[PDB]
Task: structure prediction
Amino acid sequence: IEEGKLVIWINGDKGYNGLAEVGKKFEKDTGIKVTVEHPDKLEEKFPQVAATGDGPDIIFWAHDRFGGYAQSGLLAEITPDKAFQDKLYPFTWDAVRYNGKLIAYPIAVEALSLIYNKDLLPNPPKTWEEIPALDKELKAKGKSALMFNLQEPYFTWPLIAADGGYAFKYENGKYDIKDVGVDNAGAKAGLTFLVDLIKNKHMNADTDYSIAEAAFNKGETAMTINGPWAWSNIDTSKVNYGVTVLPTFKGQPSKPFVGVLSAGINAASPNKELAKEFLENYLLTDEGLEAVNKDKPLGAVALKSYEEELVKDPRIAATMENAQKGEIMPNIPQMSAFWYAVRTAVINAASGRQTVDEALKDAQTRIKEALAVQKFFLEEIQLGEELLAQGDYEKGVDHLTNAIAVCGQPQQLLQVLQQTLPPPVFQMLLTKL
Amino acid sequence: PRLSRLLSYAGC
Ligand SMILES: OC[C@H]1O[C@H](O[C@H]2[C@H](O)[C@@H](O)[C@@H](O)O[C@@H]2CO)[C@H](O)[C@@H](O)[C@@H]1O
Ligand SMILES: CC(=O)NCC(=O)O
Result:
């Protein structure tokens, strides 16, 4: 990473040009060029590159990814004093606190809403159960009721959670990672409803973000499900839209997972002070947030002074009504496993590769299996290393062999062990493999 | 951090 410049990654659905405007203000005032990039799959690319000391100085994503980044040592602990922390809502700081340390700056609170075309649909449905018949009526006029991104489970989650699906059970401030709610009766009921819509040709399994956005913005579908960022392109399209509460399912509110868009500093950045100056003094100001927001709306921002303005917008009132019916995501490392497993279940059930029951059963099994193996691997390395530091060689090596046994490609692990273990002990270990 | 970087969803 280059000293004396800032490189920023943010997702391509957000106001990256507006963020670049903040970057030009920063460059005007300071030495310092700010390059804003929006790589594809940045939330996967970041841990790959930052593990080698490469990547952006600053990473923007929802807070759910950040505990895993911090666990891997990829993020700098951030350094705001009390006066600065008091400028943002306390719950936003909670979202970026991990093992007692703040690991990112909160920017804005994101929740999905139902977005509808008021000319096609002056009174939108209050329930999921109403959607099939509405679709049939719209299909007779060459329209459809609903299109949204089925390829990312973020957009189907509110329906899965409605009647009781959950990721990891909340226990008095902590998440219980042994208590997974992906294959429960409520999760199965909501996904079954979505998959029946598809079976009966009221929705297409292949619909993705850009298909749905184009359909809505061209006046072809009466409804979509999307976040605040999407409102700019609908403005440009001139569709007469409303933003409202998500439909209920079996009388229960849909429960979106709420994201706090957050900015982390790469642990390998040589520009940590410049990143702090940019984030605290340029971005997290009314003017900085306004520049980004004008490009693509942020949602409900973390910065009190600017949020006090935005709450007057009826679209933000709707976003907050949906947020309050949902739950703030965990930031724990296990979120990555959850999302990969549920993504697979949704796609497989929607496509007919699996039944809903089998898809979610398998997702639950995959999450719990991944977490059990990780737990065992880490515990056995620790225990083996601890026993070696005490001179019980035989028992120490036996535990290290158990960890290696549950690692399919142990070359990197063996390189790490070769750096810490005395050579005679590493040699002993090699003979057990 | 060093041991956590050896793991992914896909495996080790
Ligand atoms: O679909 C799983 C996915 O959900 C969330 O990603 C959201 C993100 O929070 C939004 O800001 C916006 O970009 O849309 C994304 C969905 O495509 C989680 O934040 C993410 O970790 C997860 O993989
Ligand atoms: C070294 C340590 O404290 N924990 C293990 C890890 O970081 O991955």
Q: What stands out?
A: Chain B touches chain A at residues 1-7, 9, 11-12 (CB under 8 Å). Residues 4 and 10 of chain B are 13 Å apart (CA to CA). The pocket of acetylamino-acetic acid (ligand 2) is lined by residues B 1-4 (CB under 6 Å). The two ends of chain B are 15 Å apart (CA to CA).
